[PDB]
């Protein structure tokens, strides 16, 4: 097989499960004219370890480095598979211009569909992004779900609803937490299911969950009447009976 | 004999360079 006829390759990595001399022997077997030091004629410089030599080659933009997996792919398929962003660890300006046309700033390509593995590589590429705030993120998620019609998914269906609970002896009093009851686990499951649990009884509250204690129903009704927007009174039975169905059951039967 | 080099026999162990140490 002369798939690597009249080409130049250099290796500066011995720190791998395959020793460098074995790689040189394979290269010679495949027809690539091995070279021990890169130069203007070399079509690549493969080095699987970021040692000092790789960093020096990086500091000069005159050539490009390739992850050793490229040779493995070439040998397994016996074909001259081109480069892709996953393999390369640095590009010359010209190769950068070439890639930018058929590839985004991230490994994901423009003209070829994607597979789960490729998307995983893309999602492992960039570093991080923590420039948002809870409200902004929630608004973004809601916009995406509404646009692309993903609300039928089992989860995230409580997102549009803000939920309050009677976990305080006195409404709007954070110093009288009633922790130690089934209401706590009810709320924790609700929030796990994408419900926006609110600890303050603001005018924007839309859903309220009440347990077996109906003493303060009158106060809730009075507050609802006072507020411009009315929030339906709901019991803990509705969420329980709805969890198994994975759907929002009608509030009429649980008003 | 005293203060001899354990790496290069026949040479005295040079003290490490200390630079400027103000009094």
């Amino acid at each position: 097989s002369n798939i690597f006829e009249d080409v130049e390759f250099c290796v500066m990595s011995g720190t791998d499960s395959q020793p460098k001399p074995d790689l040189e022997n394979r290269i010679a077997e495949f027809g690539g004219y091995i070279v021990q030091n890169p130069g203007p004629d070399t079509y690549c410089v493969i080095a699987g370890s970021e040692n000092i030599r790789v960093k020096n080659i990086i500091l000069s933009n005159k050539h490009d480095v390739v992850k050793p997996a490229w040779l493995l792919e070439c040998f397994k398929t016996k074909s001259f598979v081109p480069w892709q962003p996953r393999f390369m660890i640095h590009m010359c300006p010209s190769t950068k211009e070439h890639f930018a046309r058929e590839y985004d700033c991230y490994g994901d390509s423009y003209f070829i569909d994607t597979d789960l593995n490729q998307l995983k590589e893309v999602f492992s590429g960039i570093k991080n992004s923590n420039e948002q705030t809870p409200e902004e993120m929630a608004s973004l998620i809601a916009d995406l779900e509404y646009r692309y019609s993903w609300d039928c998914s089992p989860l995230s269906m409580f997102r549009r609803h803000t939920v309050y609970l009677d976990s305080y002896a006195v409404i709007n009093d954070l110093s009288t937490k009633n922790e130690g009851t089934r209401l706590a686990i009810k709320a924790l499951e609700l929030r796990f299911h994408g419900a926006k649990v609110v600890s303050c009884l603001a005018e924007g509250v839309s859903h309220v969950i009440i347990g077996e204690d109906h003493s303060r129903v009158a106060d809730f009704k009075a507050f609802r009447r006072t507020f411009k927007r009315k929030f339906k009174i709901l019991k803990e039975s509705w969420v329980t009976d709805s969890i198994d169905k994975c759907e929002l059951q009608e509030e009429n039967q649980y008003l | 004999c005293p203060g001899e080099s354990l790496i290069n026999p026949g040479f005295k162990s040079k003290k490490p360079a200390g630079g400027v140490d103000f009094d």
């Binding site: 423009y110 003209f111 994607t114 998914s153 | -």
Partner: protein
């Protein structure tokens, strides 16, 4: 929890390939013209 991740991956794949097809069509039509 063990499955929400793949549930999200599926939707992301669908939308991304849709957009990729859109750009493919746009560039192909323009290049032909």
């Amino acid at each position: 929890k063990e499955a929400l991740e793949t549930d999200l991956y599926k939707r992301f794949i669908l939308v991304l390939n849709e957009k990729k097809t859109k750009i493919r069509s746009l560039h192909n039509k323009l290049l032909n013209a």
